[PDB]
């Protein structure tokens, strides 16, 4: 009837070898979402619920942005979903909103897709009155790149990749290379668990407090099961309810990735999917 639909994919654009930037219509998620929150989705009736971060919102047009990396069937399937196709189930906004306010100077770090889940927080700080600096890292030398445009706008840019525009080794080498500046106040680390962990461990160099966004296996994302278990300081926390954002100093990090490797199947679902 010349209009849109509920979960319609309003835009799908590729930005890396396996990463996709979707814009999707959902007035509830668009209106209600605050930074640091996420949605759980299902693509079809045989689908699984999967967690993804709301990376931006256009409440006026009722859109929310979503960035997906293809590791298995579901993300692949959504990456294969054409513009106009609907996602069957969209649940959100979920999780505890980030803590935003006018602070001093701020440093942020993002690896892989976490960058896109890092942006919305970064965006909120700046409109809160902060002055930021950002460090971006990638998973390999040539292909699998990073978001060119969005961050440079928010602040001065630092790159870490076997290749262009910056250093080579790791994001933690880029940190500690502020030995000169040393900065102050807070930090943020989002990406693979290992990275965020070592970003925490780089509370050693600057004696800095590091915030972190955790990424465990989720099912409901509403707090009704506890698949997404997390040990904070000493106590069990649910990342979908109490998080996903915690203080890296408190997070049990080995426990997490020792639990992310819990279903070493989907080896299977991914293979069955990848047939023409």
């Amino acid at each position: 009837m010349g209009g849109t639909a509920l979960n319609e994919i309003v835009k799908k654009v590729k930005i890396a070898e396996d990463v996709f930037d979707f814009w999707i219509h959902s007035p509830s998620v668009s209106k209600e979402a605050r930074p640091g929150q996420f949605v759980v989705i299902r693509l079809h009736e045989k689908g699984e619920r999967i967690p993804l971060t709301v990376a931006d919102t256009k409440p006026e047009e009722g859109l929310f942005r979503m960035v997906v990396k293809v590791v298995g069937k579901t993300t692949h399937e959504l990456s294969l979903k054409k513009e106009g196709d609907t996602i069957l189930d969209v649940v959100g906004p979920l999780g505890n909103p980030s803590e935003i306010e006018n602070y001093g100077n701020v440093l942020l770090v993002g690896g892989g897709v976490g960058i896109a889940t890092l942006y919305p927080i970064a965006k909120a700080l700046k409109e809160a009155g902060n002055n930021i600096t950002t460090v971006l890292g990638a998973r390999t030398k040539d292909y699998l790149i990073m978001v060119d445009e969005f961050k440079e706008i928010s602040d001065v840019l630092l790159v870490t990749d076997d290749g262009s525009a910056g250093m080579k080794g790791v994001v933690t080498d880029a940190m500690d290379k502020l030995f000169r500046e040393r900065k102050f106040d807070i930090c943020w680390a989002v990406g693979p668990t290992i990275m965020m962990k070592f970003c925490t461990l780089k509370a050693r160099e600057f004696g800095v407090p590091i915030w972190v966004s955790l990424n465990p296996i989720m099912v409901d994302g509403t707090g009704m099961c506890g698949a997404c278990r997390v040990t904070v300081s000493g106590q069990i926390k649910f990342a979908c309810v109490d998080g996903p954002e915690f203080r890296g100093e408190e997070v049990d990090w080995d426990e997490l990735l020792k639990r992310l490797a819990q279903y070493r199947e989907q080896e299977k679902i991914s293979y069955e999917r990848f047939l023409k």
């Binding site: 209600e32 699984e48 189930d89 099912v219 009704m224 639990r259 299977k268």
Partner: protein
């Protein structure tokens, strides 16, 4: 000397051990009629005193005997919104059939009231339907129902029949509460839940699925835009014992296990995309129906041994007797007076063991059931590759905090009038497991019916519980 219940067709144990199809297959008409003859039509009908909503038992049994099956169904439905559910899941052994006279006889079993409620409800299902006409939207006023369990479904239905605009709000993609993601298909076929939801759909009740209230929509909006509100969200928040090794791979909340298994159908994989962990020796902690379903489900997933681990004995166990019998017939093993102390894992990632002890009869009651006291030197181990905790669960205290002036009890459940369901907040009603703590489907049903009637009494101005 004996007088037994008319036996029902059931799946064969060896074949049914592997599948999720319904185990109790249901009466034929002649079997049902043959059972209905055992009812002695007691004028004082003690049976009725064992039913929480007080179903006119001998009545629907009578009209069944007479061959007037719709009349039987009509008699049932004027009391119970969910008969096909309740006749299947009610623990008649602690309810209606525990008061049945024919069981008072020596070596004699009570009338099978539940199987008959089921039969009548099922017989009417695959035969007749009703007028498709929607009844909602006549009384012009708005009532919101949060949660689509027995309580919300019941309230919503009954309100739609009363002419009101009913908007249901559900967190999940499927409605039915525990009836969809808790109790498995081998106990409660989901055709029945879908049937009842559809029925309620045709009444003009609009369902908001995948809608988590407080997030998708703010409580304040819900309060502003609706004349009344019913809260039927249950007690679904899991708690872990918190012993060492709770964080091992292979360790599950029954909520997660049963959510994956029942809702996401992880036993149907890679058909459905949700995976489930392999374990041949699984331990289920608890002796509730939760533990029984989780165990019996794990068994159907191809586990070789399944253990029930209970701090108490067989005679304290709160499980449905029929299903415990089935559980035994399917090969579940039981550890009476057993309590885990820690879970143990290996180098890569696994549960590999569980340390346990034996308990004493010493302490008297003191919450729970008579507080078992651990015995020394009885300490032993169970070797397990998967652990599921079915120790119970509590209310969504967070969502409750978002209701200003809403009073909670000692354990955090809502305070509401026993008969009307009205709570401390004006225009807000509540019922089901979110008030009482974990109980029965029939009680959630009943709570919803009464809350609905007093929503009606409220929105008509006849009765107002909220003043200064």
């Amino acid at each position: 000397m004996k007088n037994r219940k008319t036996p029902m067709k059931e799946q064969s144990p060896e074949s049914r051990r592997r599948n999720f199809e319904e185990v109790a297959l249901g009466y034929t008409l002649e079997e049902a009629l043959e059972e209905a003859q055992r009812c002695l039509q007691c004028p004082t009908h003690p049976c009725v005193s064992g039913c929480p909503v007080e179903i006119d038992i001998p009545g629907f049994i009578r009209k069944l005997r007479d061959g007037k099956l719709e009349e039987s169904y009509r008699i049932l439905k004027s009391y119970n919104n969910l008969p096909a559910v309740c006749g299947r899941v009610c623990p008649q052994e602690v309810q209606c059939e525990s008061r049945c006279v024919v069981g008072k006889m020596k070596d004699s079993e009570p009338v099978a009231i539940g199987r008959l409620e089921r039969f009548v409800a099922d017989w009417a299902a695959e035969n007749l339907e009703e007028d498709v006409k929607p009844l909602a939207g006549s009384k012009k006023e708005k009532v919101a129902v949060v949660g689509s369990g027995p309580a919300g479904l019941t309230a919503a239905a009954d309100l739609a029949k009363m002419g009101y605009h009913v908007d249901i709000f559900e967190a999940f993609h499927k409605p039915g509460g525990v009836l969809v993601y808790g109790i498995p298909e081998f106990r409660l076929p989901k055709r029945i839940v879908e049937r009842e939801v559809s029925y309620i759909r045709k009444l003009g009740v609009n369902f908001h699925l995948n809608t988590v209230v407080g997030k998708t929509v703010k409580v304040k909006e819900l309060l502003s835009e609706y004349d009344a509100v019913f809260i039927g969200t249950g007690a679904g928040t899991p708690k872990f014992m918190g012993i060492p090794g709770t964080n091992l791979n292979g360790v599950y909340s029954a909520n997660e296990f049963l959510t994956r298994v029942n809702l996401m159908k992880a036993y149907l994989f890679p058909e459905y995309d949700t995976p489930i962990r392999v374990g041949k020796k699984v331990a289920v902690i608890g002796a509730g129906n939760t533990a029984m379903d989780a165990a019996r489900s794990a068994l159907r997933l191809g586990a070789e041994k399944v253990y029930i681990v209970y701090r108490r004995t067989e005679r304290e166990m709160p499980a449905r007797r029929e299903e415990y019998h089935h559980a035994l017939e399917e090969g579940i093993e039981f550890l009476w007076l057993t309590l885990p102390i820690r879970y143990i894992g290996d180098a890569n990632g696994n549960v590999e063991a569980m340390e346990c002890v034996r308990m004493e009869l010493k302490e008297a009651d003191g919450s729970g059931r008579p507080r078992p006291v651990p015995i020394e030197g009885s300490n032993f181990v169970l070797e397990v590759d998967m652990v599921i905790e079915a120790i119970g669960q509590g209310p969504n205290r967070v969502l409750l905090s978002e209701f200003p002036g809403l009073e909670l009890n000692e354990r955090g459940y809502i305070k509401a009038d026993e008969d009307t369901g009205a709570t401390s907040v004006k225009g807000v009603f509540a019922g089901g497991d979110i008030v009482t703590g974990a109980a029965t489907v029939i009680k959630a049903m009943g709570a919803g019916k009464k809350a609905a009637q007093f929503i009606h009494s409220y929105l008509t101005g006849e009765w107002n519980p909220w003043q200064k």
